[PDB]
Design a protein around this ligand. Structure first.
Ligand SMILES: [Mg+2]
Ligand code: NA
Ligand code: NA
Lengths: 213, 208, 209
């Protein structure tokens, strides 16, 4: 089974300790892995791009001896109206540009460390602002950001776990939002248990070197 | 190995216990999983769309207490000329809209139940009519219906097993249609074993 | 773990025992699998298309009794400026058409045999010629060839392992090129160890038994 001793978790409120859910996916995994330490770099509301506490800069706070790096972002870039930009952009002003710098930063400074990118579940319309099941204030769909992550991660060889495509649920359906989410955006504790299971499966199927007994 | 005790199988002829192959993929997995019950909701000729016994309506025959739901459709939508439509349709007269009605109904009524969509093998041309290895009567490739499935399932978070891209075979190639199919459309018992194998390892990959 | 007793490896300089790497990915796997034989059909500088020792023709050297077939090509097609063509092409003169020929051939002749295509790691620019981290002599990105492999394999139901996407590395990043490659094109021994792992993982999630 895949486990790590010094994981680092870069993300937004779904990763941040300050959460509406008391038990996060990484708290489940850190316990199962019996980690030496688990570095939480989640900040509520954070985007990958320039708009709010850019992950494309905050990544530089990841510990030098991290043995695993996970990035869990994009839902705020969608919901808080980060311009999407275009494939080939290389500055943090756009979502595409900010992914490029994030991905270059990670591969330059932790060349041998296993990494994955996690993108969020399809959100509902009940949170507020431009957090919609349909389009954000700039008129893009969540799946446009989700596609940007898939395209950009590919160019750097970084595996991409899409909770959007494969989590088994969408918060745009009330019956599932009621069971797995706090507010059609943030997973509750049940949603986090699901995410932990999805992440472990993904790691098992993509990272053989880091199988242990 | 992942297993389920009360699976429900929503599909067409490849699922229905009424024809050319005596042993289906879901028979193989029922035996392997030692199920309590295995609900066969296959109807021959059935489309996901409005044209024939719409699965986008028939999903409602799924038992309240199913603990796994697989949907295996699309091949009739292609071969019996269901209008494809486009992304953003919400009406069952198109394949895109029908997919939306179906996936909506699944997640509403079984929010906690593991489910997956299975896409069919690339077919050959021996069955006739619009069941062609090239294009159907509307000018679409089988792969256009495949992409529709891949796109719609993604919006709903529903894992997608593409036998089309991953089965290791195509019925458009005679050497493989002769081994694994009855007629270049329907898998034979050997084809159903392959399907069962691919499903089982997909499950192992995506479920704990 | 999924293992095979008589695998055949069709590819370029990354597969060929000509190469600058002493222990290739298939050498590692042959040793894990306890093989009866392990057929190395790598030819250095080889393309899938017509230009240099076309795999779309050479695949016929694969042994009749192969119990597994991997095709590991495309990088020379990109880097040596093989015309990409378009979806639906049929000649070996284009990349799309050569892929079609290769796939028809493999599925016709080895219908019951498990098989997969492996796509190359993102290359850097220090090798030379059109082996660029940006675009080839024809204006194409490496990912255009990678997208061709994705589409074509799918039409024949052949699983595709994209090392480009999923390897955890790119040789366009110097920090990773210095560790995992000989020259930003060819993986070194540490690079082949990583490839062996990804291949083994991919085999376990797409195949039973
Ligand atoms: Mg490209
Ligand atoms: Na899926
Ligand atoms: Na090769």
């Amino acid at each position: 089974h895949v486990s790590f001793k010094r994981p680092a978790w870069l993300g937004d409120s779904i990763t941040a300790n300050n959460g509406l859910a008391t038990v996060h996916y990484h708290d489940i995994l850190a316990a199962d892995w019996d980690v030496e330490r688990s570095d939480n770099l989640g900040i509520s509301g954070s985007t990958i791009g320039s708009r709010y506490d850019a992950m494309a800069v905050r990544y530089q706070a990841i510990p030098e001896d991290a043995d695993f790096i996970a990035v869990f972002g994009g839902v705020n870039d969608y919901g808080r109206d980060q311009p999407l930009g275009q494939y080939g952009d290389c500055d943090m002003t756009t979502f595409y540009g900010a992914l490029m710098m994030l991905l270059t930063g990670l591969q330059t400074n932790w060349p041998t460390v296993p990494k994955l990118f996690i993108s969020a579940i399809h959100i509902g319309s009940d949170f507020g602002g431009s957090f919609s099941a349909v389009t954000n204030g700039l008129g893009y769909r969540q799946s446009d950001y989700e596609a940007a992550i898939a395209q950009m991660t590919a160019d750097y060889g970084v595996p991409h776990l899409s909770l959007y495509r494969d989590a088994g649920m969408t918060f745009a359906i009330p019956a599932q939002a009621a069971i797995y989410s706090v507010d059609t955006l943030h997973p509750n504790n049940a949603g986090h248990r699901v995410i932990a299971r999805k992440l472990q499966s993904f790691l098992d199927s993509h990272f053989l070197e880091h199988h242990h007994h």
